[PDB]
Design an enzyme around this catalytic site. Structure first.
Site, PDB file in Angstrom:
ATOM      1  N   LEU D 248       0.823  -1.208   0.000  1.00 19.64           N
ATOM      2  CA  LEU D 248       0.000   0.000   0.000  1.00 19.64           C
ATOM      3  C   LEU D 248       0.857   1.258   0.000  1.00 19.64           C
ATOM      4  O   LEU D 248       0.434   2.292  -0.529  1.00 19.64           O
ATOM      5  CB  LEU D 248      -0.945   0.008   1.203  1.00 19.64           C
ATOM      6  CG  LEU D 248      -1.664   1.329   1.515  1.00 19.64           C
ATOM      7  CD1 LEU D 248      -2.642   1.740   0.389  1.00 19.64           C
ATOM      8  CD2 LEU D 248      -2.398   1.242   2.857  1.00 19.64           C
ATOM      9  N   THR D 251       1.360   3.529  -3.219  1.00 15.44           N
ATOM     10  CA  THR D 251       0.392   4.511  -3.694  1.00 15.44           C
ATOM     11  C   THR D 251      -0.224   5.320  -2.565  1.00 15.44           C
ATOM     12  O   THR D 251      -1.243   5.977  -2.789  1.00 15.44           O
ATOM     13  CB  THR D 251      -0.732   3.834  -4.499  1.00 15.44           C
ATOM     14  OG1 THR D 251      -1.391   2.864  -3.676  1.00 15.44           O
ATOM     15  CG2 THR D 251      -0.182   3.156  -5.763  1.00 15.44           C
ATOM     16  N   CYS D 252       0.343   5.277  -1.357  1.00 14.25           N
ATOM     17  CA  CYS D 252      -0.267   5.944  -0.206  1.00 14.25           C
ATOM     18  C   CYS D 252       0.868   6.299   0.750  1.00 14.25           C
ATOM     19  O   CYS D 252       1.419   5.423   1.417  1.00 14.25           O
ATOM     20  CB  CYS D 252      -1.306   5.037   0.442  1.00 14.25           C
ATOM     21  SG  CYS D 252      -2.116   5.738   1.897  1.00 14.25           S
ATOM     22  N   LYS D 253       1.227   7.579   0.800  1.00 14.98           N
ATOM     23  CA  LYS D 253       2.504   7.940   1.398  1.00 14.98           C
ATOM     24  C   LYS D 253       2.406   8.547   2.801  1.00 14.98           C
ATOM     25  O   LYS D 253       3.447   8.751   3.437  1.00 14.98           O
ATOM     26  CB  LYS D 253       3.246   8.889   0.452  1.00 14.98           C
ATOM     27  CG  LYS D 253       3.622   8.205  -0.857  1.00 14.98           C
ATOM     28  CD  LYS D 253       4.563   9.043  -1.591  1.00 14.98           C
ATOM     29  CE  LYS D 253       4.198  10.525  -1.406  1.00 14.98           C
ATOM     30  NZ  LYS D 253       5.326  11.430  -1.186  1.00 14.98           N
TER      31      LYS D 253
END
Ligand SMILES: [Mg+2]
Ligand SMILES: [Mg+2]
Ligand SMILES: [Mg+2]
Ligand SMILES: [Mg+2]
Lengths: 339, 339, 339, 339
Positions: D248, D251-253
């Site tokens: 994850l 795409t999700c920082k």
């Protein structure tokens, strides 16, 4: 985890008062030798703790009961002056880690105002911290409260310099101690007596109109507000729906909720409870709550491991951990201040 | 909405004390004439209020400061006996709507124990309600606390009869009033002074081992526990992590949380705050919280419209509104008790 | 610290399903090799964890999606029977530490009722645990819900045997997965999809009258109630003030708060949040909340260190930790059950 | 009591859509005749309500499902343009009382971006309000989500214009309605389905990196955040301790708590619960919560009597009631904006 936290109920004692320090430690510490070392140290042990626990900046203040225990006004004033000169020299070693609150003899409003001014103007102190009523009278059995017109000159000095006043507790003494506390002495201090004194004094300021005459005045209480947020509803009801119809409105022009929005702050010192913090966020607002520790009566580990790991939204963790105090004390920068 | 609620901090006064009633009303009521009528009425106005607001059963008790204001022990005892005889005859009119707490002179442990026993055995009273320390001494300036060994005979009578003791507040008087309250007199009563007295007394019972010697003893505080739940974390920390390493364990064998699970109850009297109630549910548990009003200092409308409309799960609304008190006071039935 | 805790959302898998276990682990575990060992182990690793963390008794259940993933009714039924026989033998090794929930094929109400009855009557299982809807149809793209009259025979079997039904989640599949979740697949499982399924199914049971036809039925949701407590106010308002005026009252005869007081339970599985727990105590009541872990998807350490150290009144810690479940499941003595 | 409140989930419908208005009213209103008048009225009834209840300013938006129900992209675009032109003219009658959100066809990112830009640049609209996914495909059975790279041009337009996007719910339709909701239809709308849609879409934007590509983007959810705050702990745990170790993070920082501090807002529309509001203040922060009503699906009386009388600190009542929205929407003076 969070860096750059600010703590501001953090005590020191003068090295020459070791006997008095050990007496106080015999009531409130389980390790007297470590306590003596920690309460007197400024720039080594205290910095090591702060480095391990993400505390960027600390505003130091004198241990309780401090100058408020001294009922000789000449002795009390000389002691306050000595303490302020001493801590000013100590914190110059680490100006990006330490500020200081003024220590004051509160025997006389103008005398206290002048020494507060000296501390702020000469040393850049951040405000005042006073341990609840000044002992006075022949055997120190009288109490000087600050919630009256004689103290207007002092409160106006606070608002002119635009610095806050921290109303710290002190122990019950003399007649009050004998009558209410001696037969239940384990309640002295954090368990009950401390909050009873501070809440009485601050709500006296409220109901005697101090914040009406000095609407810019900022007052800080530790220990999540010394019971007051618990009774916010009850105090507000008995003010607005009862006493303000019987005469209180003559000397008290706003609601208790107004004064907490405009004048009063609370601190997390010695009250490392997320359940109570959440309740305080509801009753006083996260904007009005500041992190603090109550070192060395509390440990950095207890306070910081609680706060760093407490479940809390990121906005309020920032505000309570540093950003509220950063704005209140006009801190341009300090170690890790924007980390 | 909810029917059959139980309230148990509900006051009356003797008709012959109208002057004293009006003095107390001048401090704590905004409508003295209605107050006089309501505090003296038992079976008409009080029933009309309860019928409109879903209150099935009320345990009545004598107004503060009551017998605790009487420092002549002979006069005080005769007054307690008179009050108990009077209210017993009054509540017989409506036994499915009213019970009563014993009113006591607390000058002497055995004398108080005997009168409590008379009330329970002869009249079926539900326990005792006492207004915090008995005034005593030459000018009533001494205080008699009940948290010591002399009172064991009294507390054992409470546990033998298996009835609770309600520690109600009273006003500060004499030396304490002059020293702490006279210069901030609007804080007297519900705003602050009441809770300071009750919390001191109950935590004195805790730290002097009353609940260790009398583990079945049930003690009730009004006003959501007189600040104590706010400091549950702080008291527990300063007991278990500090004072119990310095000597407190000698006279205090359980934690403050144990005593709230086993011995102490809190009431919603004069504290109609769902936010504070939720916090108390977290800190003391819904099992240990009872509805009450504080009539006629508070109105049925304020207390009941709050509670009936408060957002609350159905389980705890039942428990707090009646089922906790139904079990504690062994109520087999009363008006609307299972509605 | 608390001993004799009960956990009841604790999963196992059959040894012969290693590939299915590994695929599921690839979605939901960060240590697949340990996960494979832990989900298949019953009597060694799982006991060691429980001994270290004060868990006296665990009710075990089959991993998701389990039999609800099987749309061939013959294969599904045979697998349910296989699983129940397997776990009955396994828990006989440590019967004072383990119970079991029935694993069921839910293709046919009578078939499922008969296998639940066999589990209770032959093996003494404690209830049923089912992973949301039963996949059905030629390609498994249809869903069998249980909130309708065809399932009355099944729910009547639950109430006759007086055992609860745990509505556990399963993953979204087929068309539902393709349309809603495939393009945001990281939300599958605990982050979102699980709760969406269970809350839909349970509120379907509510609004289709299952708890009206079966008022004794007890339904359990994990994960502090799969969002439902957050919307208790909003659901209640949109039922009682809206939909119940438009036709919902025809098939739904009590309020949502009634059903949570009388029929619905929530557990703490996978939701180790004191702040959310406190909110759930307000919205559902501590009497209706059960400790649970969600092992091996969650660790014993995470769940038990949270619960054992959470700030909580002693009454509710006891209820949530074990006493609520002891009463619900009519449990005899087990390890540390009265410690 | 509080004046100058701002509400921003306040719907209108075109007069020519009476049949659609009545069908929607048949699902969600108990007084269809009043609803038809109220949802079409802009400048009379709606102003009267706002004057009675201290609402100074309202940002208006098109009723659900609105343009998102239209799967013909040509018809959808023409209707969006028609609606925006219509409401621009209507709000010019009382520009100190009303603003507007853009109504958009979301079939094509560039087309939607251009119409949002026209709304902001030509009419001074305050942002966009969109009813979840755009129906698409030959029969309207497909769904267009906006949490992917094709929509970067649109989100970049939001940040360039510096206006927020309100993700409002719509009803489930087509295959999703048939499979999940048709057999439990009373859950459609506020009881459950609405929040399931919006939370899916917003958490999709989170996990597909929209707020990483567009860090200035502000997204608003009604109904106290569509369940998401209840699971803040659980989502955060299953992101940071699970999915972020499995892919994850690509795409999700940032954390879910970061996005609520930096990108996401919630409003009080249709969720008039002080208990839930307090929980949201803990989980999301009062700085991120906006008052709103959800008129005419909710009444001004329900929303404003709740908020005006809720127990709340004065700081947060001011922020939630108007000051948060004043800053977010860069509002000039409006009626009672500084009262
Ligand atoms: Mg301190
Ligand atoms: Mg009273
Ligand atoms: Mg599970
Ligand atoms: Mg709406």
């Amino acid at each position: 985890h969070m860096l750059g936290k600010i703590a501001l109920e953090e005590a020191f004692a003068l090295p020459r008062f070791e006997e008095k320090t050990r007496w106080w430690a015999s009531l409130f510490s389980t390790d007297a030798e470590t306590h003596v070392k920690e309460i007197t140290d400024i720039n080594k042990i205290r910095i090591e703790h702060a480095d391990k626990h993400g505390v960027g900046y600390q505003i130091l203040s004198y241990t309780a009961p401090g100058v408020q225990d001294i009922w000789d006004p000449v002795e009390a004033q000389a002691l306050a002056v000595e303490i302020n000169d001493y801590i000013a020299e100590q914190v110059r070693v680490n100006p990006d880690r330490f500020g200081a609150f003024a220590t004051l003899s509160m025997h006389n409003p103008k005398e206290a105002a002048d020494e507060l001014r000296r501390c702020v103007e000469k040393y850049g102190f951040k405000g005042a911290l006073v341990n609840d009523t000044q002992r006075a009278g022949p055997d120190g059995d009288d109490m000087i409260f600050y919630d009256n017109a004689d103290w207007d000159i002092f409160w106006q000095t606070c608002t002119e310099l635009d610095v806050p006043f921290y109303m710290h507790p002190r122990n019950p003494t003399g007649t009050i101690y004998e009558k209410l506390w001696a037969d239940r002495k384990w309640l002295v201090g954090p368990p009950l007596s401390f909050a009873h004194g501070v809440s009485l004094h601050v709500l006296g300021m409220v109901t005697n109109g101090v914040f009406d005459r000095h609407p810019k005045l900022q007052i800080i209480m530790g220990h999540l507000g010394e019971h007051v947020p618990f009774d916010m509803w009850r105090i507000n009801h008995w003010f607005e729906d009862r006493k303000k119809l019987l005469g209180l409105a003559e000397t008290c022009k706003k609601t208790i909720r107004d004064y907490f929005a405009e004048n009063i702050w609370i601190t997390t010192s010695g009250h490392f409870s997320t359940t109570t913090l959440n309740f305080c966020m509801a009753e006083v607002g996260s904007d009005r709550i500041l992190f603090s520790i109550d070192y060395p009566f509390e440990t950095f580990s207890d306070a910081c491991e609680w706060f760093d790991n407490a479940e809390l939204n990121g906005t309020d963790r920032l505000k309570i951990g540093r950003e509220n105090a950063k704005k209140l004390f006009k801190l341009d920068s300090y170690k890790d201040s924007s980390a």
